[PDB]
Every structure is written in C-alpha cells, then in structure tokens.
Design an enzyme around this catalytic site. Structure first.
Site, PDB file in Angstrom:
ATOM      1  N   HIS A  60       0.858  -1.201   0.000  1.00  0.00           N
ATOM      2  CA  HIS A  60       0.000   0.000   0.000  1.00  0.00           C
ATOM      3  C   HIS A  60       0.894   1.251   0.000  1.00  0.00           C
ATOM      4  CE1 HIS A  60      -3.582   2.388   0.856  1.00  0.00           C
ATOM      5  NE2 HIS A  60      -2.961   2.917   1.892  1.00  0.00           N
ATOM      6  N   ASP A  62       0.879   5.208  -0.178  1.00  0.00           N
ATOM      7  CA  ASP A  62       0.151   6.465  -0.066  1.00  0.00           C
ATOM      8  C   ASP A  62       0.821   7.602  -0.852  1.00  0.00           C
ATOM      9  OD1 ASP A  62      -1.869   5.791   1.995  1.00  0.00           O
ATOM     10  OD2 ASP A  62      -0.012   5.278   3.071  1.00  0.00           O
ATOM     11  N   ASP A 174      -8.023   1.002   2.097  1.00  0.00           N
ATOM     12  CA  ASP A 174      -7.778   1.995   3.133  1.00  0.00           C
ATOM     13  C   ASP A 174      -8.738   3.182   3.297  1.00  0.00           C
ATOM     14  OD1 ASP A 174      -6.087   2.352   5.424  1.00  0.00           O
ATOM     15  OD2 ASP A 174      -4.645   3.577   4.378  1.00  0.00           O
ATOM     16  N   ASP A 311       1.739  -1.515   4.416  1.00  0.00           N
ATOM     17  CA  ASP A 311       2.131  -0.185   3.907  1.00  0.00           C
ATOM     18  C   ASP A 311       3.591  -0.181   3.472  1.00  0.00           C
ATOM     19  OD1 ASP A 311      -0.435   0.420   4.602  1.00  0.00           O
ATOM     20  OD2 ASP A 311       0.074   2.110   5.948  1.00  0.00           O
ATOM     21  N   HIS A 441      -6.844   9.398  -0.085  1.00  0.00           N
ATOM     22  CA  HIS A 441      -7.452   9.281   1.240  1.00  0.00           C
ATOM     23  C   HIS A 441      -6.633   9.881   2.397  1.00  0.00           C
ATOM     24  CE1 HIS A 441      -5.225   5.417   0.653  1.00  0.00           C
ATOM     25  NE2 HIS A 441      -4.942   5.563   1.942  1.00  0.00           N
TER      26      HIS A 441
HETATM   27  C1  LIG Z   1      -3.409   5.585  10.082  1.00  0.00           C
HETATM   28  S1  LIG Z   1      -4.317   4.744   8.776  1.00  0.00           S
HETATM   29  C2  LIG Z   1      -3.706   5.069   7.139  1.00  0.00           C
HETATM   30  C3  LIG Z   1      -3.231   6.480   6.841  1.00  0.00           C
HETATM   31  O1  LIG Z   1      -4.219   7.494   6.933  1.00  0.00           O
HETATM   32  C4  LIG Z   1      -2.497   6.307   5.508  1.00  0.00           C
HETATM   33  O2  LIG Z   1      -3.467   6.284   4.474  1.00  0.00           O
HETATM   34  C5  LIG Z   1      -1.799   4.971   5.680  1.00  0.00           C
HETATM   35  O3  LIG Z   1      -1.799   4.198   4.472  1.00  0.00           O
HETATM   36  C6  LIG Z   1      -2.465   4.241   6.852  1.00  0.00           C
HETATM   37  N1  LIG Z   1      -2.786   2.856   6.483  1.00  0.00           N
HETATM   38  C7  LIG Z   1      -3.431   1.941   7.433  1.00  0.00           C
HETATM   39  C8  LIG Z   1      -2.489   1.115   8.334  1.00  0.00           C
HETATM   40  C9  LIG Z   1      -2.043   1.685   9.518  1.00  0.00           C
HETATM   41  C10 LIG Z   1      -1.179   0.923  10.326  1.00  0.00           C
HETATM   42  C11 LIG Z   1      -0.752  -0.368   9.991  1.00  0.00           C
HETATM   43  C12 LIG Z   1      -1.212  -0.941   8.782  1.00  0.00           C
HETATM   44  C13 LIG Z   1      -2.084  -0.180   7.979  1.00  0.00           C
HETATM   45 ZN   LIG Z   2      -3.417   4.639   3.031  1.00  0.00          ZN
END
Ligand SMILES: CS[C@H]1[C@H](O)[C@H](O)[C@H](O)[C@@H]1NCc1ccccc1
Ligand SMILES: [Zn+2]
Ligand SMILES: *[C@@H]1O[C@H](CO)[C@@H](O)[C@H](O)[C@H]1NC(C)=O
EC number: 3.2.1.114
Length: 1014
Positions: A60, A62, A174, A311, A441
C-alpha cells in the site's frame, strides 16, 4: 427509464434497515476480538472439493501522508517498484498487484527502454496486475463523484496508453468507510468486481455470520439491479498480514516473514515468525491451513482470498526473498498433503474473482443483493472516524474550487483544436493530475502531516494557475474576430476574478478595475457559464469609483448596484471585531445573463456623477460605542444604531428576520405566509480529558456542544435593490447572510485562531417535525436517508456532508447546500448542524503523529432553502433515498459551478465580440454536461471530443416548468462523422449511434459519448 422514486427495491441487505436492527455491542470475541471463535467441519473439503487459496502480494503506497509524494517516491516507492520488476522477472510464479498509478507513471517514465520492455512483459503475462488503476485510491466520504471519475480516468488513460490494460477489478483497502458512488462509477467504467475493507466492526460481524461479505452492490434507488457490482468485503480489523490470513492475529503474524528482527519489525502478540524448514513445515502448515479454513467459513465458495502485504512493503530484495521462499515451502508441503485438501498459490485479484465466479456458475453459490453505504466507520469501541469529514477545511473548500476550474478550463478549450505551442494539453494535464492526487485518502481527508498538506496546497495553486491560463486564452479566441485574433500564448488577455476563493478576509487577491478620466474610461468583462442552460446570476467586481454603469455589448444599459468594500478586523486595541470600509474601492453588482456553455461580454464605464442605471446600497452599523465610517465618494453616508432585531426582503423573495446578534431567526416565504422559526446558532465541542482523544481522523467529543458566548457583537446591514446582507463579527467567525431575491447565501469566514481542543459547529434550529430522520448526500451524486440512533454515541451520528443535507416533515423541508465537504448531523428533531473547523492538540493514535494545529482562515459558503413540500411526490416511507427540489438543486449548482468572471487586462480589446454560445441548446434543468474534453491533439486527422452527461432526479411538486431543447452533445461541434457511447473514462466504445445522435440519459444515470469530426 426506471422510476427512482416510487418503487422500493427489494434487496437482501439494506444498510439503513440493518442499522435499525443491529445492537452494535462491542464484546470480546476471543482471538478474533470483534468476531467469535470460528468452527469448521474438517470434512467439508475432500479430494473432490478442495479449498483453492490465492495469496495476493501487495504494497500500500500512499501518494502523501507522513511524507510528500516525492519524498515517499525517492525513499520508498521507486525501490519497491524497481525490486518488484527484478523479482517478478526472475521468479515466474510470483505475483504482485499495484493500485496507485500516480506512482507507477512517475516510475515508468524514469525507466530506461530495456526496463520499460521488461515491465510491459510482466504485466502482459499476468505477474504484475493493476487493481482499480486510478491515479490514487480515493477518499470516498468527501470526494465529489466528478473528481473520483477524473482521477480514475487519469490513471486508466495512462495504463491503456503505456501498459495496454484496463483493470476490471477494484481494490480499496484503506478509505475510511465506503460509498456506493464507487460501484456506480466503476460499473459504468467496465468493472466487474470490487473489494472494500474499512467497514464498521459490527457490520463485519453481522455480515460474516450470514455469509453476506460478498454481495451484489446496487444503488439505493435501483429496482431492477442493472447498477449492481459484485463486491467483496474483507472480514477483519486490518489489511495487514496479521489480519488477513485468518481470525487469530497471534498466529497470522507468524506468517509475515518480515517480522523476525533484522527489518526492525516484530509481532505485538509476542510470538515471532520462524523460517520454514523441513522439520517445522508440517506444524507450521497445520497452523496456517487451520486459519485459512476458519476464514473460508465466512464465505460461500471454495476459493479463498489471502492478501499478503502492508504499507510500503516489498521494498528490499531481501524482503521479497524472505516472503517468497517461505511461502513457496509452505505451498509445496500443503499442496502435496492430500489430507489438507487445499491447493494454494500466489495469485492476483482478478484471478481470485474469476475463480469465485466460475464457482458461482457451477451452481456452488448464490450471492445476496445489498444497497446502502458504509459510513460512519469505527475500527474499534466508540472510535468513529467522523473527524476527517471536517479536518483541514481550507483544502476541502479548495478541492471544490479547483474541481470547477478544471471543468471550465477543459470545456472552454475543447471548442477549438490548439497548436502545441499554446501548451493547452500540458497545462490541463498538470491541473487534472494535481486535483486527482488530492483525492487521495490522506489528501482531501485532512489526515496528512502539516508539510504534506502544504505540498498538496502548492500543487493545487499551480493547477489553479494552469486553469486560469487555459480559460483566458480560450475566452480571447472565442470572442475575438478571427481575422484579427493574434495570440501570444504566454500573455494574460484576461484575469479571473473570483469573489469566493480564497475569499474576502482570507487573501486580498482580487484586482480592482481602475477607471478614471485621466487613465481609462471603461473596461470589458466576460462571464462564462459552464452549465448547459441559459443562466442569470448576479456578479460583482471591484472598481475604483462608485460612479460606474454597466452595458451589454449592444450598448443596452444593465441595472447595477454599488456597495462599499467592507473588511473585518479583529481590533487588538479595542478588543472588538468590526468592519472598515474602503474609501477608494467599491463593489459593482449586476445580473449577468449567459448562454448555455457560453460567454457574455459587458462593459463597465465611469462617469463624473451618479449614473442613471446604478443604485447605491444603504449601510447600517449596529453596535454600542460606534465611531465614524467614511467611504470616500460613496454617495450614501453610513448610519449607526444600537443592536436591534431587523428584517429584510430583496425583490419578491423571502423576508428574513434577524436577532440583535445578527443571526437568522425566521423566514417568511411570501407576503401572507407565516414567519417560520429558523435559527442559526454557533456552538463548540471540546475534547475528553481522559481516554481516547479526538484527532485528524476521530471525533470524540466530551458531550453535546455548548453555545459560543457571543458578547454584544457588531452587526453590519447593507440594503440594496439587487443585494442585501447582514454580517456579524462573532468570536472565530464572520457570519454573513446574503439576499438576492431567492434562497439566501450564507458565508462564514472561519478563523479558529488559537482555540485549542475546540470544534466549532454551525446549527440550525427549527420546529420541523423530522424526528430521527435526516438526509445527507454521497459525493454530490445522491441523497441518502439517515436515521439518528441514540443507541450509538454522538460521533457515530455524524456523516459526511459533501454537498448538502436536509430535514423534512409532511409539510416543510429545510435544505442546506454546501460549497465544501464538512461533517454534520441532525442530533434532535428539527435540527441540522455542520462543523466549520476543528483545532486539536492531541494525536488520535492512528499513526499520523500530530494533532491539527495548522488551521487558517477559510471562507465556507452555503445556500439555505426553506420550502413547502406537502405537494411534492416523494418516495414512500420505506425508500432509502431522498431527492432535491428544483430550487435546491439550482442553489447547489450556484455554489459548485458559478459563472466565471474575466477582466480584460489591456486598455483596448480590438475585435471584441459580445457573446458565444447563443445557439447552444438550453437543456432541461436536471441535465448537466459534467465533462466536456477534447481527446485528440491537433495532429489527429479525426478529432474526438468526449462528454459525460449526468441527469439528476428532482421532485415533482406541481410546477409546470417546461419548454426546453433536446441536447445532443454529438452535434455541439461541426462536421460530426461518428457518435459513440463509451465507458465513463472514454476508453471503450459501447455503441455506435444512429444518426450520430447522443440520446439524453435517464434520471440518476450518467453516460459518456465521444463525437468524431472530420
Ligand atoms: C493511520 S491509517 C492510514 C493512513 O491514513 C495512511 O493512508 C496509511 O496508508 C495508513 N494505512 C493503514 C495502516 C495503519 C497501520 C498499519 C497498517 C495499515
Ligand atoms: Zn493509506
Ligand atoms: C493490447 O492488448 C490486446 C489484447 O490482448 C492485444 O490484442 C494487442 O495486440 C495489444 N497491443 C496492441 C495492439 O495495442
């Protein structure tokens, strides 16, 4: 056409009905904390019926979050893609899926030709598969559907051109909650399947118990089901490896081979992964297959999806090796032990869906139908993600400004073919890509670090400048005699004038038209109307004299009103917030009338004294202890008085009454009708002193909001023949109510200043007997019925307000339309409320690592429409949708797609013309040309122009309102040789149209057409 009002769809799962029945208890389910201890019959799978498992590697990425797009690209993503290319090239059975095309395009263009060819080969052979194929994985709450389509089209157009593929499966792991606008757009863009993940933990449990995690997701008004798109909802708390192999993260974490130590990662459950060997592979497979068979119990077929990623994973070559080799040892053992009755392999997303549908066709499963949305998401306990419906509201408003500018630039420049030297395609591509990136996002959601928000803002500012350049070159070409037109493609023939962005009090960015006997007697201005119907709208310009009159290009006088230029100041000496008037700049206001998708020219001329067709507003300042307010040559002296209630009426429109604090208290629609109580109030929510704190994502209020103490605020009343208003300087908000003859416009200049741990809300109090029902929109596309649930906490009753909301009873409706997405609710019968800004010192522990303390002044805009609805034909009580009236829809269009205003820069415009588009058809009011885009450069022998046509559905309330012309977009440009209906991205032709005529669409439908011209 299907009736979208009178036929309630029969679906297996309707989310509003499910919400009414669900208990939402948060009980400890064991290792699956929010589920139950899954049991399965070992005899379910045997030699004749094996469990087919697809392990799908992913990463993933971002496009901005804790780092900027470019920072992540340099530190992480370029390495992930370069190593994916090498590892997939060298290991033919390994697979990988990729979602974010903004990064992929950035990478691919930097590759040498030998590597570009290797990349194309691993895509063509199926090892690397694009999922969704949008520029980003967009937010689904605050995004406008037009921009969701824009970013999808940007990414897929790049993929078709360079990779020769168009994804038909979507991957959205996400976004913080999910909208049915996605399957709506995707199904009309050739998709066959989609996957989602962030849905309320109580919904995952409920649907898992009924094996309804895979469903045919149709729109809420769709009776027949033609909008349906197969959807897979993941079952667990996250998409990381610990929450994707099965129900027990303590076990699944042992199968994330990047967590043994050398990579700086570990397992929170305290049992680490161990390298697979011949001595442990049977015990390790026993454990893993048990998790898989438990997960398989939640679904209906014998094909199981096992995502393998997190991520920014797959960055290091050693990471590719450690995951691949250990899984290969597991597959070789599992697949050779008949007793497991499992066949496991790496796969892609499309491979999973193809196998699920093969099982369906073999009659092994039937899937339920579902309608509704998946807001508001909570990942655990009472942690509802409604804060990001408001976080960083300045940029949320900027998104809607740039949305309109991109549409207007693409439409204005589509009328002609342009030489490459004009850089039109270059500037439009930049503008589309920056707006598309912000749909991410962590972009529009307001969930990125401060420096990343600054990067998105700078990108969008450059995009706005690109749109201005393209728009003004286009206006000059459309309105200058052809044999006189002599363009300099770097010159500014016009400058845009925008009265609402950044807005008065936000930035002094507007140019004053400077006229004078000894410098310039007059100035041409031009208005553009991107909507496909004739439109009138009041427009205003700043001028250097109050003695200005307006004419059209036939020299017919146009009635105008001059008002002062008022600015509000927080006076640090007197400790009051009050207005100051200019003694050298004035506002001239007049009604512009512009053709459908057209232009209209006017002239502003100075005179030595009051012009015959220009009137002057009166001004009244209400406050104790007033001081003088000189206004230069303005002809009416300002009046003063102690605070008092007041009433105003412009034209034949409504009469509005205000409290002594300058806030609306009632609306009287006509002379005889009653003064309906409609009260504006500002309140504040705080943050909890113990437990979980609100942050960029979460809204965790410390109880219902408290009224903001207003003191004795200063109120300014301007009364004019064309426009009147009431403005008041409240703490943190200059609140304005503007009247022009119809529903009022509300503007709030919001500056939360240094008020830490505060969220400011604007509430409307009425006596409308709405009960627990209210309506909010989804992505500016549709209105969905909401039911306030007292069994859920306050923050769970907040929903996105991307473009509007309303309450109603049998007789009356109050609709609030917005010019920016914000969070809101109806917490009691008769109320509507919408958050203005939030300033939070604490982090909400989701990984952002900061609060929200970078607030800046923002001008929020709205229209407030009170209407009688007793005669309207509305859906029945069981229908899940609502629909706007004509007046409310036009009010929304006045906020999102206003007239554009251009001021000629030089002294004389030789060859100026008075109008463009007078012969364009004026289409029925519910129809819009959402997109007009030329698809070919000037070297193409056959030019192609794409149109996206959207028809909304407006309530029938007894107004005959008719006589309009059929709009055939295929004949808007001359010499049409072919007209085709296409997918919404313009990438696939679906129908060759007879007579080269593009039919209009049905209510709630969107279609795309491409015309070809010799
Ligand atoms: C804080 S949630 C989200 C953020 O707003 C960004 O988009 C990031 O990808 C994160 N993924 C999710 C994720 C977080 C921790 C561990 C694995 C996946
Ligand atoms: Zn994300
Ligand atoms: C693109 O993909 C199609 C479908 O596989 C294939 O026929 C074509 O040759 C590929 N390349 C071209 C010609 O664009």
């Amino acid at each position: 056409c299907q009736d979208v009002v009178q036929d309630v769809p029969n679906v297996d799962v309707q989310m509003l009905e499910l919400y009414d029945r669900m208990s939402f208890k948060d009980i400890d389910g064991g290792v699956w904390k929010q589920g139950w201890n899954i049991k399965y019959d070992p005899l379910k799978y045997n030699a004749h019926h094996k469990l087919k498992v697809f392990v799908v590697p992913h990463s993933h990425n971002d496009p901005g979050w804790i780092q900027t797009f470019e920072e992540y690209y340099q530190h992480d993503t370029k390495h992930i893609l370069s190593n994916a290319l090498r590892h997939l090239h060298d290991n033919p059975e390994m697979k990988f899926i990729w979602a974010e095309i903004s990064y992929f395009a950035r990478f691919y263009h930097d590759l040498g030709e030998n590597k570009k060819l290797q990349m194309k080969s691993i895509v063509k052979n199926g090892q690397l598969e694009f999922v969704t194929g949008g520029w980003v994985m967009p937010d689904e709450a605050n995004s406008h559907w037009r921009n969701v389509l824009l970013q999808l089209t940007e990414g897929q157009t790049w993929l078709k051109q360079f990779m020769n593929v168009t994804p038909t499966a979507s991957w959205a792991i996400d976004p913080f909650g999910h909208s049915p606008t996605m399957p709506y757009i995707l199904q009309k863009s050739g998709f066959k399947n989609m996957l989602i993940q962030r849905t309320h933990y109580s919904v995952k449990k409920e649907l898992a118990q009924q094996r309804q995690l895979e469903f045919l997701w149709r729109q809420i008004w769709d009776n027949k089901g033609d909008t349906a798109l197969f959807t897979h909802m993941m079952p667990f708390y996250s998409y990381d490896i610990p929450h994707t192999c099965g129900p027990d993260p303590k076990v699944c974490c042992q199968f994330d081979f990047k967590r043994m130590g050398s990579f700086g990662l570990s397992c929170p459950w305290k049992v680490p992964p161990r390298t697979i060997s011949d001595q442990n592979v049977a015990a390790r497979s026993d454990l893993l297959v048990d998790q898989w068979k438990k997960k398989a119990e939640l679904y209906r077929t014998n094909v199981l999806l096992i995502p393998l990623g997190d991520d920014f994973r797959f960055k290091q070559n050693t990471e590719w090796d450690v995951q691949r080799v250990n899984y290969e040892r597991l597959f070789e053992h599992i697949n050779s032990q008949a007793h497991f009755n499992v066949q496991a392999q790496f796969g892609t997303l499309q491979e999973y869906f193809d196998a699920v549908h093969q099982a369906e066709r073999a009659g092994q499963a039937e899937f339920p139908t579902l309608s509704g949305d998946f807001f508001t998401y909570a990942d655990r306990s009472d942690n509802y993600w409604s804060g990001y419906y408001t976080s960083r509201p300045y940029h949320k408003r900027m998104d809607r400004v740039l949305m309109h500018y991109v549409r207007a630039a693409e439409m204005l420049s589509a009328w002609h073919s342009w030489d490459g030297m004009a850089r039109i395609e270059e500037r439009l591509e930049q503008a589309r890509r920056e707006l598309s990136l912000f749909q991410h996002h962590d972009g529009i959601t307001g969930t990125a670090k401060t420096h990343v928000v600054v990067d998105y803002e700078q990108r969008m500012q450059e995009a706005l400048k690109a749109c201005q350049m393209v728009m003004q070159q286009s206006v000059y070409r459309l309105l200058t005699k052809p044999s006189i037109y002599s363009p300099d493609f770097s010159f500014s023939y016009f400058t845009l004038d925008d009265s609402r962005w950044p807005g008065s009090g936000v930035e002094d960015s507007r140019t004053t038209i400077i006229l004078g006997e000894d410098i310039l007697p007059s100035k041409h201005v031009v208005m553009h109307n991107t909507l496909p119907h004739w439109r009138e709208q009041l427009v205003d310009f700043y001028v250097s004299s109050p003695f200005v009159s307006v004419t059209d290009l036939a020299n017919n006088p146009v009635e105008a009103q001059v008002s002062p230029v008022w600015s509000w100041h927080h006076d640090t000496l007197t400790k009051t917030i009050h207005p100051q008037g200019s003694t050298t700049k004035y506002r001239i206001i007049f009604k512009a009338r512009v053709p459908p998708m057209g232009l209209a020219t006017y002239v502003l001329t100075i005179s030595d004294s009051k012009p015959e067709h220009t009137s002057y507003a009166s001004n009244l300042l209400l406050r104790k202890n007033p001081t003088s307010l000189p206004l230069g040559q303005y002809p009416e002296d300002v009046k003063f008085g102690d605070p008092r209630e007041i009433s105003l009426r412009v034209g034949n429109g409504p009469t509005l009454a205000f409290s002594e604090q300058g806030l609306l208290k009632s609306i009287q629609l006509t002379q005889d009708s009653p003064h309906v109580p409609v009260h504006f109030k500002f309140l504040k929510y705080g943050v909890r002193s113990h437990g979980d704190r609100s942050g960029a994502y979460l809204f965790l209020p410390n109880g219902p909001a408290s009224p903001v103490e207003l003191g004795q605020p200063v109120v300014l009343v301007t009364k004019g023949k064309l426009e009147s208003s009431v403005s008041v300087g409240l703490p943190s908000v200059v609140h304005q109510t503007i009247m022009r003859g119809g529903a009022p416009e509300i503007r709030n200049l919001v500056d939360i200043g240094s008020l830490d741990n505060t969220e400011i809300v604007m509430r409307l109090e009425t006596h409308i007997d709405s009960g627990d029902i209210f309506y909010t929109d989804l992505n500016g596309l549709q209105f969905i019925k909401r039911r306030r649930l007292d069994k859920l906490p306050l923050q769970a009753n907040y929903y996105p307000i991307p473009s509007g909301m309303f309450i109603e009873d049998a007789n009356t409706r109050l609709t609030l339309l917005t010019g920016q997405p914000l969070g809101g609710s109806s917490l009691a019968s008769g109320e509507l409320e919408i958050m203005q800004d939030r300033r939070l010192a604490s982090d909400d522990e989701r990984g952002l690592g900061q609060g929200v303390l970078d607030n800046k002044p923002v001008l929020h805009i709205y229209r407030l429409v009170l209407e009688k609805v007793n005669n309207c034909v509305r859906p029945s009580k069981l229908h899940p949708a609502g629909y706007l009236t004509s007046a409310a829809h036009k009010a929304s269009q006045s906020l999102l797609d206003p007239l554009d205003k251009f001021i000629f820069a030089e002294n004389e415009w030789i060859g100026a013309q008075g109008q463009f588009g007078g012969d364009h058809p004026s289409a029925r009011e519910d129809l819009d040309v959402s997109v007009m885009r030329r698809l070919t450069k000037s070297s193409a022998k056959t030019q192609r122009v794409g149109y996206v046509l959207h028809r909304t559905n407006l309530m029938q309330c007894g107004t005959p309102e008719e006589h309009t012309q059929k709009l055939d977009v295929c004949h808007l440009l001359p010499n049409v040789a072919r007209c085709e209906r296409t997918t919404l991205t313009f990438l696939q032709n679906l129908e060759h149209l007879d007579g080269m005529v593009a039919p209009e669409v049905c209510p709630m439908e969107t279609a795309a057409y491409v015309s070809s011209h010799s």
